Design an enzyme around this catalytic site. Sequence first.
Site, PDB file in Angstrom:
ATOM      1  N   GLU A   1       0.389  -4.305  -3.914  1.00 36.26           N
ATOM      2  CA  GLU A   1      -0.845  -3.508  -3.984  1.00 36.26           C
ATOM      3  C   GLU A   1      -0.585  -2.023  -3.717  1.00 36.26           C
ATOM      4  OE1 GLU A   1      -4.155  -5.472  -1.921  1.00 36.26           O
ATOM      5  OE2 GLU A   1      -4.130  -7.021  -3.483  1.00 36.26           O
TER       6      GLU A   1
ATOM      7  N   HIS B   1      -5.044  -7.696   0.956  1.00 37.36           N
ATOM      8  CA  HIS B   1      -4.151  -6.563   1.183  1.00 37.36           C
ATOM      9  C   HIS B   1      -3.109  -6.795   2.276  1.00 37.36           C
ATOM     10  CE1 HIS B   1      -3.322  -2.527  -0.077  1.00 37.36           C
ATOM     11  NE2 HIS B   1      -3.512  -1.987   1.117  1.00 37.36           N
TER      12      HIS B   1
ATOM     13  N   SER C   1       0.847  -1.208   0.000  1.00 35.57           N
ATOM     14  CA  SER C   1       0.000   0.000   0.000  1.00 35.57           C
ATOM     15  C   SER C   1       0.883   1.259   0.000  1.00 35.57           C
ATOM     16  CB  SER C   1      -0.961  -0.023   1.194  1.00 35.57           C
ATOM     17  OG  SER C   1      -2.205   0.566   0.847  1.00 35.57           O
TER      18      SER C   1
END
Lengths: 267, 266
Positions: free
Chosen positions: A125, A241, A101
């Site tokens: 991600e 995630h 992230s």
Amino acid sequence: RTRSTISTPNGITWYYEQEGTGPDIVLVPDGLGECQMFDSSVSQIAAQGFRVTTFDMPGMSRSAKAPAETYTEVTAQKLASYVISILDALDIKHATVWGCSSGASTVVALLLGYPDRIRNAMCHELPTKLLDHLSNTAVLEDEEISNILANVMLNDVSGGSEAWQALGVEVHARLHKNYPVWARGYPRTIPPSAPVQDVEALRGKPLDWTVGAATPTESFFDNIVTATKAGVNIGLLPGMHFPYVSHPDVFAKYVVETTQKHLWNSS
Amino acid sequence: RTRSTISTPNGITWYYEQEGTGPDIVLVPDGLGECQMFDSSVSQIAAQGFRVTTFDMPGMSRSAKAPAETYTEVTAQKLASYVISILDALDIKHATVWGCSSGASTVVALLLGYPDRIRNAMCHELPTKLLDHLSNTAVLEDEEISNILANVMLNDVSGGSEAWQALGVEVHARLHKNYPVWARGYPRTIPPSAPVQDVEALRGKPLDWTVGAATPTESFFDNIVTATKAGVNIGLLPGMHFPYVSHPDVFAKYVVETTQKHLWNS
Ligand SMILES: C[C@H](O)CCCC(=O)CCC/C=C/c1cc(O)cc(O)c1
Ligand SMILES: C[C@H](O)CCCC(=O)CCC/C=C/c1cc(O)cc(O)c1
Ligand SMILES: [K+]
Ligand SMILES: [K+]
């Protein structure tokens, strides 16, 4: 395992953990900045002959003693500068780095900006698009934000509800406090800072990119396209995630195998 | 809407539907071979000035009068040869084609094998890998296969359970019979036949590729990588494996806009 704090000249007092001896591997948290999510994997990775370092991110959890600049208007490039500062403080000269992230944005910025310091980067991600539904939480009251995002984490992106909940009350109490910090500081400025506008800058770089196997295709579709355009290794980890939470053994195996691959290529 | 049958010299008697006048657009079913899944979209697409043709696939639903070779050991190349046969029979000389799943493999095989016949192809979620859990259903009794796969379609890949159910009892009665035909004939032979070996063969071709936005990334991850390597347009439709069922209006708009783009480029 070492569990301690260290202060850097930029005013951040970091909480960090370190285990093992060998080549350095650094695990950068996601936007929530909570390194206890790595607890199981740190031991598994270190046992394969690596010194593994992780830390709470500035303004988050146990690294909350930090100047406001470090957790407001946050960008990949700001976070990369902060991570370099603690690597300097811990005398880590060369490191393999992992990040998901905002942490993914961070490790790509690290690799590009400090190539002498980064052996190889694993990004997972990486957010490149503004999402209004996330950005809009920034104007809500603290407790509204924490309630909404706690729900989003558990139900939409954890990739494993049992594992997520099993982080336990101590961790989730810290996350609860972090959600408004993240909301006000990250979603409006992190995606435009994504260090992937220059595909040719990525080509040939020691970068390994992943997306969650169960993640809806639309969420990080753009990652797969960008990685493929740049000829960067792109693959999948189980879950969504937070593979280090949902699938810590598989996560650890991936980090170890990927680091070993680059240690071979370096020689 | 014309609803009729036509017999091709490979032994197949096809059930087909046609609506509209204008450039030809052909909607090839997924492996379940059931063209009533296109019902809403056929009308929406035809209304924009196209002749839309669709059909049940050999051995499936109302195209069940067909030789065993057409629904056993099925490959993209076999299906493409069958689709060309019905296009010939309907005197459709040039066509835009859509296909999902085995239908996607089919339309890419069509584009590569019959470039003079295919204006452009839209492929959706093209299977390139063997999946043992699907292949293994081939050895079960008919009723277990139908029970298992009806559940998988409804709960796992429909991309919209209400819309899936709303296909109605007659459609699901036909699908019930198709599931064992599909299981025995398709999953063990369709993926190795994927016409995506050669990325350079795809480069510069009038191909538009999609994956479902809600589809788990792992399912057609390979599609996205392959399309990007080949420089082919790759994008998303809402839902999962059956956008023409789950989101018929968005599906029709996509088919119309994509066809219009290629008519301009022509
Ligand atoms: C764990 C994560 O780092 C922070 C919690 C938000 C979340 O998980 C949603 C799914 C992934 C989105 C990341 C993201 C999305 C944005 O639009 C902006 C941004 O700064 C980060
Ligand atoms: C509608 C579809 O064409 C037939 C029903 C099976 C299904 O939807 C499962 C998800 C998509 C897989 C298609 C697929 C997967 C394979 O391994 C082999 C193959 O021949 C087809
Ligand atoms: K695991
Ligand atoms: K729709």
